[PDB]
Design a protein around this ligand. Structure first.
Ligand SMILES: Oc1ccc(-c2nnn[nH]2)c2cccnc12
Ligand SMILES: [Mn+2]
Ligand code: NA
Ligand code: NA
Ligand SMILES: [Zn+2]
Ligand SMILES: [Zn+2]
Length: 454
């Protein structure tokens, strides 16, 4: 009926290995990128303090229908307190099974979840919390400021997820743009059967997820190399999800039985994440799951230097699909280049290689555009435009290195792949808008080269 996928890798790093989270993720990457997800059990004495008043934490609940292959929208950025939500969640689970809330086997919850989502007769609706930290509901990890206890030793931990949007080895930290949906940690309050649909993280980034407390979270993960296999399977069984959407807050995702994927030769792995354990998702690794009961998790995206080539591939993939970007990859690269003197040495080396590809591609695109008859040009500071004012009309990519404009359509832009998609004017009426000349870009790359040599 339901055949559980094989278990994903579980790591138990020693203290020395657990020290640098980025060094450890780099160490386990050859194993875990084969499974998409993996579990990290921290050293036994790594125990961050969790303290909260369940009566003063409020949040707006989200409602969720549990029907396989039904379209759901990705969460965007009525009221429960944490106590009243917990009482609702506990009464729901215990009444669903007629068993004490904490005595329902996890195997049975898994079997029952995949039964109810597939039965048209069942009409189970659950609720959950999902948002970034705010004054009414803050991070589960300690943050600076009133007076913190001596458990401020977890303030500067690499595994304190609030430090991920600031650590140097995360290239997302250097982004000046306000991408709070991606840079800041998300807080997830779950209950029995509340679920996250199959998805990958934006720009094919990593994510790391910590379960602060509560009943386990059940995960299904698919390695990054099988991403296109999974999408082809879902295109057959749910074509309505693959209709192009007007913006980022309209993306369609769904619940789907992993046995359906396994039947179509898609490798799927599972794990039960328990309180105090991390789950790490790797670039382009599809994942979904559900909560066994009342719990509280915190998750954040991040990008290592290993990710830089994949991040460029992803934006190219977004362009082919006409999907909106969260940020401009080229803007991030150039921002780091302009800070080459204070960059980590290994970061500088990796950024330099990506920038060399960027420059070669940009040079060829400008040659192609010049051969189409675009002659006039002017420097343009793309980073000053709001993101929705610098998307290619055709493919929706966020422009930064260059774009084409015509005075007959004020404010509209196309990227250099879509010069023919702007208007019916002859190309000599167009202007190439460019952030940098080639003569600006090579010294920027040389700064990274010099920095990479100590
Ligand atoms: O990558 C993710 C992992 C887990 C979750 C999650 N945990 N509990 N409920 N949902 C989640 C939610 C929204 C977006 N992404 C998510
Ligand atoms: Mn996610
Ligand atoms: Na159902
Ligand atoms: Na994608
Ligand atoms: Zn375009
Ligand atoms: Zn025109």
């Amino acid at each position: 009926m339901f055949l559980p996928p094989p278990e994903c890798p579980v790591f138990e790093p020693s203290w020395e290995e657990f020290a640098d989270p980025f060094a450890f993720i780099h160490k386990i990457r050859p194993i875990a990128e084969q499974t998409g997800i993996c579990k990290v059990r921290p050293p036994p004495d790594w125990q961050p303090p969790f303290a909260c008043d369940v009566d003063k934490l409020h949040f707006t609940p989200r409602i969720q229908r549990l029907n396989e292959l039904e379209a759901q929208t990705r969460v965007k950025l009525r009221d429960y307190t944490l106590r009243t939500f917990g009482e609702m969640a506990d009464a729901f689970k215990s009444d669903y099974f007629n068993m004490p809330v904490h005595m329902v086997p996890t195997e049975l919850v898994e079997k029952e979840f995949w039964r109810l989502v597939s039965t048209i007769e069942e009409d189970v609706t659950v609720e959950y919390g999902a948002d970034i930290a705010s004054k009414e509901f803050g991070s589960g990890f300690p943050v600076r400021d009133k007076l913190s206890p001596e458990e401020e030793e977890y303030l500067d931990s690499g595994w304190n997820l609030n430090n991920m949007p600031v650590m140097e080895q995360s290239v997302l930290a250097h982004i000046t743009a306000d991408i709070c949906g991606m840079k800041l940690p998300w807080l997830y309050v779950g209950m029995c059967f509340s679920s996250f649909c199959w998805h990958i993280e934006d720009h094919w980034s990593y994510s790391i997820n910590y379960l602060h407390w509560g009943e386990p979270k059940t995960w299904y993960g698919v390695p990054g190399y099988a991403a296109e296999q999974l999408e082809n399977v879902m295109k057959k069984l749910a074509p309505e999800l693959f209709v192009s959407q007007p913006d980022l807050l309209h993306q369609l995702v769904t619940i789907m039985n992993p046995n359906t994927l396994m039947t179509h030769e898609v490798p799927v792995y599972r794990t039960n994440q328990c309180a105090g354990e991390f789950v790490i998702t790797f670039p382009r690794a599809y994942h979904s799951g559900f909560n066994q009961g009342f719990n509280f998790a915190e998750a954040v995206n991040f990008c290592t230097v290993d990710w830089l080539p994949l991040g460029r591939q992803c934006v190219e993939h977004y362009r082919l699909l006409h999907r909106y970007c969260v940020f401009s990859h080229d803007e991030m690269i150039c921002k780091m280049a302009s800070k080459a003197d204070v960059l980590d040495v290994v970061v500088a080396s990796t950024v330099q290689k990506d920038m060399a590809i960027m420059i070669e591609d940009e040079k060829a695109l400008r040659e192609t555009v010049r051969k189409l008859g675009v002659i006039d040009s002017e420097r343009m500071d793309f980073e000053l435009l709001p993101d929705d004012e610098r998307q290619c009309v055709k493919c929706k990519t966020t422009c930064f290195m260059s774009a084409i404009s015509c005075s007959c359509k004020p404010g509209l832009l196309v990227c250099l792949h879509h010069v023919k998609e702007l208007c019916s004017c002859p190309p000599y009426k167009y202007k190439l808008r460019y952030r940098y000349t080639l003569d600006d870009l090579y010294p920027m790359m040389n700064a990274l080269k010099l920095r990479a040599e100590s």
